[PDB]
Amino acid sequence: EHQPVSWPAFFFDTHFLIWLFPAGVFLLFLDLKDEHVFVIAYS
Amino acid sequence: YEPPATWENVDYKRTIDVSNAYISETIEITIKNIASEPATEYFTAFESGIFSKVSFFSAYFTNEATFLNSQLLAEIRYGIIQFPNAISPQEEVSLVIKSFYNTVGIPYPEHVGMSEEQHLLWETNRLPLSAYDTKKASFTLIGSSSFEEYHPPNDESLLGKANGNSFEFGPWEDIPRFSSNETLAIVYSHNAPLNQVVNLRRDIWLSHWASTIQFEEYYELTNKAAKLSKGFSRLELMKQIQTQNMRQTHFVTVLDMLLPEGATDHYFTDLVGLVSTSHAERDHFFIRPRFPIFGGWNYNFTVGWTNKLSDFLHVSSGSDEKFVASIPILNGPPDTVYDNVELSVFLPEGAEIFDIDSPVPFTNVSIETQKSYFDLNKGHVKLTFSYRNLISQVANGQVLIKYDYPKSSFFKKPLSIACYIFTALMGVFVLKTL
Amino acid sequence: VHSHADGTSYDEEPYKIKDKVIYSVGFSEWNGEEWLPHIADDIQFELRQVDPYYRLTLSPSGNDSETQYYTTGEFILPDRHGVFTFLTDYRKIGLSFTTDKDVKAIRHLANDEYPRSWEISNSWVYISAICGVIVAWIFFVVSFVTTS
Amino acid sequence: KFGIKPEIHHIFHAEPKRVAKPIAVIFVLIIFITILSLIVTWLNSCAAAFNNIPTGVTAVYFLGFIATIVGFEVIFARYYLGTSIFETLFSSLYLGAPGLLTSTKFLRSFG
Amino acid sequence: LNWFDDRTWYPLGRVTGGTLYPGLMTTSAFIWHALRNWLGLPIDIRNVCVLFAPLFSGVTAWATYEFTKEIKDASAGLLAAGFIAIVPGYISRSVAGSYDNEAIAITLLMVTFMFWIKAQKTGSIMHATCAALFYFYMVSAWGGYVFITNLIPLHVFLLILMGRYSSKLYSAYTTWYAIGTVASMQIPFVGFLPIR
Amino acid sequence: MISDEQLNSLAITFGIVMMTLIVIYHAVDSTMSPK
Amino acid sequence: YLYLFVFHSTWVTRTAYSSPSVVLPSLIDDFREAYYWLRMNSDEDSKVAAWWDYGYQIGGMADRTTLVDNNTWNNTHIAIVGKAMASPEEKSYEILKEHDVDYVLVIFGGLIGFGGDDINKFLWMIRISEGIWPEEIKERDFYTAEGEYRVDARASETMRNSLLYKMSYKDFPQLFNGGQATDRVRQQMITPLDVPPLDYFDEVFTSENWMVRIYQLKKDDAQGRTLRDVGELTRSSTKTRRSIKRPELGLRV
Amino acid sequence: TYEQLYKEFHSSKSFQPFIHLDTQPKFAICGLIVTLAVLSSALFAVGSKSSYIKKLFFYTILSVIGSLFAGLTTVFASNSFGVYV
Ligand SMILES: *[C@@H]1O[C@H](CO)[C@@H](O[C@@H]2O[C@H](CO)[C@@H](O[C@@H]3O[C@H](CO[C@H]4O[C@H](CO)[C@@H](O)[C@H](O)[C@@H]4O)[C@@H](O)[C@H](O[C@H]4O[C@H](CO)[C@@H](O)[C@H](O)[C@@H]4O[C@H]4O[C@H](CO)[C@@H](O)[C@H](O)[C@@H]4O[C@H]4O[C@H](CO)[C@@H](O)[C@H](O)[C@@H]4O)[C@@H]3O)[C@H](O)[C@H]2NC(C)=O)[C@H](O)[C@H]1NC(C)=O
Ligand SMILES: *[C@@H]1O[C@H](CO)[C@@H](O[C@@H]2O[C@H](CO)[C@@H](O)[C@H](O)[C@H]2NC(C)=O)[C@H](O)[C@H]1NC(C)=O
Ligand SMILES: *[C@@H]1O[C@H](CO)[C@@H](O)[C@H](O)[C@H]1NC(C)=O
Ligand SMILES: *[C@@H]1O[C@H](CO)[C@@H](O)[C@H](O)[C@H]1NC(C)=O
Ligand SMILES: [Mg+2]
Structure with a gap:
């Protein structure tokens, strides 16, 4: 469990959120507020 | 202490059957009364060692099927027999006594391979040990293929006569009373697994709402057969079962529980989880332990099932709120021996016992309360008996409980939950309006 | 037999590091007829x-x-x-x-058996600070709701 | 070692050393005088005194508020003297419930 | 809390009082005691330990709902809950049998963050003391509190240099730190690390 | 006891019901709320 | 897309993650059988020595004292067990006795093809135990001349005499009637003349599928002989005769 | 006396259950529906702005009913799930 992992194991356990995830990050970057910075840094 | 000599044994023939993992003694005696005032008593003599472990003692006339009031007393020890009608001063009457001990012979070699046959050694008394003068006496052993003695006596008269299926002894024309100076020791072949339940506790949960009675039993099982030398070896075991050699081997592979007539929801559980090698056919529950129980190995497990309640309760005639329950006392493997039995019956939340009767004398009876699912006050009424020595298929009885369960407490079970829900709601109200 | 220095056995209170225990054993010799x-x-x-x-x-x-x-x-x-x-x-x-x-487990010291914070003399100046801050805070809270 | 073996003892570690009492007493006296100085500054020097005081029912709510504030610190001080945690929790739950109501009533009434 | 385990690492023993995070077990024991004394359902501790993870896999859905209710409207929080209820990346470590620290360690991860947002967005002190208390509970329940301890300061710092400092960051962050650090020092396994 | 296929169907139905009620709520809120 | 999301996150959980870790569904359970044997038939104060990634189970299911377990915090106490399971039996019997070890259990999936047995994570034992005892153990000897890791007839004379090899292949050749046993995880033939006899340990349990095997230390000899001499006396009884030979030994102290 | 109790046992009638265990799931679901169709009105009443006395009255009057119904559904459901009474 202490290793890196390829790209299939990201679509495996996140069906279609994996390509809405960059979209969500960009749409938070569009209108920055206080909490959006926290969410972006966390992401 | 010696009882007043009052009777004379004019015939005394005893037979011991060693075929089913517990000594079952059967003595047939014709008895004559000494000329005196008519007495109604009889004292059978058990040695202090054997008397410590005896689980059944009956005595009946040959002519009449009905039994007598056979009872144990409370260093030779005695058991009391009492007749319905006083015997004449000079009369001759036959009688038959049956006792069931709880001691089996120890394995003689004690180290045998898992394919060899084992021999057992048992130590008894040759000459009859009675409290009265005996005239004629005969001794017979049955139930095994081959018998042999061990340090035989030089005297020819005290020597067993072999028979095809039995091992008899020559009749002695005159024997004095209290004669126990010859300790016979005999070895015999026996291939049974020699089970022993060190501790059984079985719970019986009555329930009137669902109308089901469910049994749960917790066995602690020990094999008493001869241990195996060179230690375990799976190769030998799995190579011998592929040949036709699983005839009467002395290790336990499959047990056969005998449940009541219609059982459902069988389960077989172990301390470390669920065992999947169980199989419930009609009126039979086959169980395969995790590992075969060789000599000296312990296996502790649990087995449970469910039955309809209409077969065990009966509402009374005079009133519709007095119930009589008849719980079976034992139903397990075919021929085991129990060294402790703890029988717990859990009557419903508001029951109240009126009568308790048992067909086998118990050691201790007590009444407590124990809380279970949705028991919000005083739980269930637990009634526990403690028996000490019991045999599997000859200690067959039914404990009869007689209690009452009024409808004023039958419907209190939903109300006792309605009370909590109403209190929670009236608390949320105050917490939200303040 | 081994037991605490004062008499209590191991089963009443188990052993802990830097305790005081005592051991005792008895021997006997057989000269052919009776022990000595x-x-x-x-x-x-x-x-x-x-x-x-x-x-x-x-x-x-x-x-x-x-x-x-x-x-x-x-x-x-x-x-x-x-x-x-x-x-x-x-x-x-x-x-x-x-x-x-015989094999016995000797446990460590529990939180309840360390010396208290006032038995020590090095830490009498760290409790005066806490007591003073608490008293000052109480008086401040009292005087805050009683002043224009 | 067929016959006999040498004796062995365990050499313990030296315990950490405390400090002399007079220094601690001096440093306690300093903190005490500092606290007294703060109190004196509040009372007289800074002219920050009890201008208005609540009366009647508002004064009873004031007494309740002070009782809560002081009772929590009494609970904590008693817990610092080897009182069980569960007992402290129960004594705090049996005081917060009336105390919260009284304190909120005071803080809404007085303002 | 003072358990000395002499049935592991046989000649050396093990001090299980200061090598263990006692937050999962205390919660399981509290749930067992509540289910056995205040509801009338005596349930074997094995069943509580087994079914702990599925039960606590709905509180994390609620926490994600209440945390997305801050970043956007409530209508956009229910979707997040619907996502985190059934997603294999979180199901993998919270299956019906798993009784690890992460079973309880993600729920709190969300709850603390929720309060932090609620504290940083409004500026109140009572919403930072709740964040400090749930960060102490996460410190007790899991060794991954270092993530929060290194992520909240990053948020505050990124708001400092971006030029968005206000009088709310001061109160929120200083209260959170001053309470959370001294509260997390109370775990015997953590010890004095938060300053060393 | 409940089988495995029955449990699979139950889980799928719960997920479908949840994902439909969420969309119903969102489509009601998008119109009925003042934008 | 939301519906495909549900139909995916249900299938993945059904297929991959919902797999019991104590019962192989291929329904075989040889771990619980051996652990329950240890729990029932061994006295409560006995110590069991196994590799460090089963200790928790042994503590939870078998309820016996272990020497190492999963939360590895002392890395030398694990090197001790690594050196025990990779040295000749005459040194293992001395390393395992000063720690008061009664039983030793190994995993062996050569009959069902388990893959995660103890004979293929042997190399990790060798590495861990070699870091702090370079002279005692050397990884170079376990590999053969050409540089391969074999358990076949053409295996190195250092692995053939190790403890784990002698302990996990005790009766495996004789299991098959022909006398030519085929390992499944390694896919290598095994002859009954390969495995040497075990003189200091004696087998006390092994599961139905030979997966978990529990051995016990023999009690030291009463007359003071080395147990290898007892072994050579019991296996070579009639032919091992010498007429007269003055023994060469140090002067009696 | 064992003989007379054993005589009374066989003579008497058998046990007729109140509500058969085969038709209890029906009552379970038909009571689970009602016990929430009513207890929502309680929360609506307490939430609604009105006189305190009227709120109390129209809360308790239809809270007692929900209490009884829930306390009678939680027995049928418990029996139907396999954990009797
Ligand atoms: C993790 O697990 C591992 C493995 O299980 C643990 O590792 C073990 O730890 C043990 C304790 O730390 C350790 O035991 C010590 O090993 C020392 C090794 O010394 C080596 O060199 C000497 C020569 O210098 C050799 O003789 C020796 O054999 C080694 O090769 C020993 O030296 C230690 O011996 C001392 O303690 C034992 C036990 O009490 C005594 O019998 C012995 O006589 C020594 O005692 C002296 O020192 C002690 C110190 O407390 C005194 O109390 C005592 O009175 C003696 O004092 C005399 O000598 C000192 C020093 O000269 C002098 O100041 C004083 O005045 C007296 O003259 C001891 O044997 C294990 O070896 C070690 N095992 C391995 C494999 O590494 C590890 O601890 C675990 N981790 C944790 C965190 O627990
Ligand atoms: C399993 O059953 C055996 C048989 O009764 C139990 O063994 C007894 O254990 C107690 C306490 O350890 C001893 O005092 C008895 O002498 C043991 N009996 C025999 C016949 O040896 C055992 O405790 C049970 N439970 C477990 C977990 O093994
Ligand atoms: C009988 O059982 C009761 C109930 O626990 C107990 O108090 C009593 O001591 C027992 N007596 C004997 C002789 O076992
Ligand atoms: C010690 O005991 C022996 C044997 O009882 C006795 O002869 C002797 O006098 C005793 N000595 C002392 C000092 O008590
Ligand atoms: Mg972990």
């Missing part, structure tokens, strides 16, 4: 985890009709927790061999 005390001065007790931590020499402190009792002086248990074996093996050639060991 066995006067020997070479016996040694070993308290050992994996290699000896204590190796004391027993002294004769007890006498019986047919038994000689040897005991160790009150000794402080080692400074590290673990699972220690108390052992006494009398093995000298020309004479019978006797061993009797």
Whole structure:
């Protein structure tokens, strides 16, 4: 469990959120507020 | 202490059957009364060692099927027999006594391979040990293929006569009373697994709402057969079962529980989880332990099932709120021996016992309360008996409980939950309006 | 038998590091007809985890009709927790061999058995600060709601 | 070692050393005088005194509020003297419930 | 809390009082005691330990709902809950049998963050003391509190240099730190690390 | 006891019901709320 | 897309993650059988020595004292067990006796093809135990001349005499009637003349599928002989005769 | 006396259950529906702005009913799930 992992194991356990995830990050970057910075840094 | 000599044994023939993992003694005696005032008593003599472990003692006339009031007393020890009608001063009457001990012979070699046959050694008394003068006496052993003695006596008269299926002894024309100076020791072949339940506790949960009675039993099982030398070896075991050699081997592979007539929801559980090698056919529950129980190995497990309640309760005639329950006392493997039995019956939340009767004398009876699912006050009424020595298929009885369960407490079970829900709601109200 | 220095056994209160225990064992000799005390001065007790931590020499402190009792002086248990074996093996050639060991767990000190914060003298200036801050805070809260 | 083996004893570690009492007493006296100085500054020097005081029912709510504030610190001080945590929790729950109501009533009434 | 385990690492023993995070077990024991004394359902501790993870896999859905209710409207929080209820990346470590620390360690991860947002967005002190208390509970329940301890300061710092400092960051962050650090020092396994 | 296929169907139905009620709520809120 | 999301996150959980870790569904359970044997038939104060990634189970299911377990905090106490399971039996019997070890259990999936047995994570034992005892153990000897890791007839004379090899292949050749046993995880033939006899340990349990095997230390000899001499006396009884030979030994102290 | 109790046992009638265990799931679901169709009105009443006395009255009057119904559904459901009474 202490290793890196390829790209299939990201679509495996996140069906279609994996390509809405960059979209969500960009749409938070569009209108920055206080909490959006926290969410972006966390992401 | 010696009882007043009052009777004379004019015939005394005893037979011991060693075929089913517990000594079952059967003595047939014709008895004559000494000329005196008519007495109604009889004292059978058990040695202090054997008397410590005896689980059944009956005595009946040959002519009449009905039994007598056979009872144990409370260093030779005695058991009391009492007749319905006083015997004449000079009369001759036959009688038959049956006792069931709880001691089996120890394995003689004690180290045998898992394919060899084992021999057992048992130590008894040759000459009859009675409290009265005996005239004629005969001794017979049955139930095994081959018998042999061990340090035989030089005297020819005290020597067993072999028979095809039995091992008899020559009749002695005159024997004095209290004669126990010859300790016979005999070895015999026996291939049974020699089970022993060190501790059984079985719970019986009555329930009137669902109308089901469910049994749960917790066995602690020990094999008493001869241990195996060179230690375990799976190769030998799995190579011998592929040949036709699983005839009467002395290790336990499959047990056969005998449940009541219609059982459902069988389960077989172990301390470390669920065992999947169980199989419930009609009126039979086959169980395969995790590992075969060789000599000296312990296996502790649990087995449970469910039955309809209409077969065990009966509402009374005079009133519709007095119930009589008849719980079976034992139903397990075919021929085991129990060294402790703890029988717990859990009557419903508001029951109240009126009568308790048992067909086998118990050691201790007590009444407590124990809380279970949705028991919000005083739980269930637990009634526990403690028996000490019991045999599997000859200690067959039914404990009869007689209690009452009024409808004023039958419907209190939903109300006792309605009370909590109403209190929670009236608390949320105050917490939200303040 | 081994037990606390004051009398209480191990089953009442278990052992902890830097405790005071005591050990005692009794020997007897068979001269062919009846037992007698066995006067020997070479016996040694070993308290050992994996290699000896204590190796004391027993002294004769007890006498019986047919038994000689040897005991160790009150000794402080080692400074590290673990699972220690108390052992006494009398093995000298020309004479019978006797061993009797027992394995006991010696636990660490619980939070309730450390010295309190006021028994120490180095930390009397750190409790005065807390008490003063608490008193000042109480008075401040009282004077805050009672001032224009 | 057929015959006999040498004796062995365990050499313990030296315990950490406390400090002399007079220094601690001096440093306690300093903190005490500092606290007294703060109190004196509040009372007289800074002219920050009890201008208005609540009366009647508002004064009873004031007494309740002070009782809560002081009772929590009494609970904590008693817990610092080897009182069980569960007992402290129960004594705090049996005081917060009336105390919260009284304190909120005071803080809404007085303002 | 003072358990000395002499049935592991046999010659050395193990001090299980200061090598263990006692937050999962205390919660399981509290749930067992509540289910056995205040509801009338005596349930074997094995069943509580087994079914702990599925039960606590709905509180994390609620926490994600209440945390997305801050970043956007409530209508956009229910979707997040619907996502985190059934997603294999979180199901993998919270299956019906798993009884690890992460079973309880993600729920709190969300709850603390929720309060932090609620504290940083409004500026109140009572919403930072709740974040400090749930950060102490996460410190007790899991060794991954270092993530929060290194992520909240990053948020505050990124708001400092971006030029968005206000009088709300001061109160929120200083209260959170001053309470959370001294509260997390109370775990015997953590010890004095938060300053060393 | 409930089988495995029955449990699979139950889980799928719960997920479908949840994902439909969420969309119903969102489509009601998007119109009925003042934008 | 939301519906495909549900139909995916249900299938993945059904297929991959919902797999019991104590019962192989291929329904075989040889771990619980051996652990229950240890729990029932061994005295409560006995110590069991196994590799460090089963200790928790042994503590939870078998309820016996272990020497190492999963939360590895002392890395030398694990090197001790690594050196025990990779040295000749005459040194393992001395390393395992000063720690008061009664039983030793190994995993062996050569009959069902388990893959995660102890004979293929042997190399990790060798590495861990070699870091702090370079002279005692050397990884170079376990590999053969050409540099391969074999358990076949052409295996190195250092692995053939190790403890784990002698302990996990005790009766495996004789299991098959022909006398030519085929390992499944390694896919290598095994002859009954390969495995040497075990003189200091004696087998006390092994599961139905030979997966978990529990051995016990023999009690030291009463007359003071080395147990290897007892073994050579019991296996070579009639032919091992010498007429007269003055023994060469140090002067009696 | 064992003989007379054993005589009374067989003579008497058998046990007729109140509500058969085969038709209890029906009552379970038909009571689970009602016990929430009513207890929502309680929360609506307490939430609604009105006189305190009227709120109390129209809360308790239809809270007692929900209490009884829930306390009678939680027995049928418990029996139907396999954990009797
Ligand atoms: C993790 O697990 C591992 C493995 O399980 C643990 O590792 C073990 O730890 C043990 C304790 O730390 C350790 O035991 C010590 O080993 C020392 C090794 O020394 C080596 O060199 C010497 C020569 O210098 C050799 O003789 C020796 O054999 C080694 O090769 C020993 O030296 C230690 O011996 C001392 O303690 C034992 C036990 O009490 C005594 O029997 C022995 O006589 C020594 O005692 C002296 O020192 C102690 C110190 O407390 C004194 O109390 C005592 O009175 C003696 O004092 C005399 O000597 C000192 C020093 O000269 C002098 O100041 C004083 O005045 C007296 O003259 C001891 O044997 C294990 O070896 C070690 N095992 C391995 C494999 O590494 C590890 O601890 C675990 N981790 C944790 C955190 O627990
Ligand atoms: C399993 O059953 C055996 C048989 O009764 C139990 O063994 C007894 O254990 C107690 C305490 O350990 C001893 O005092 C008895 O002498 C043991 N009996 C026999 C016949 O040896 C055992 O405790 C049970 N439970 C477990 C977990 O093994
Ligand atoms: C009988 O059982 C009761 C109930 O626990 C107990 O108090 C009593 O001591 C027992 N008596 C005997 C002789 O076992
Ligand atoms: C010690 O005991 C022996 C045997 O009982 C006795 O002869 C002797 O006098 C005793 N000595 C002392 C000092 O008590
Ligand atoms: Mg982990």
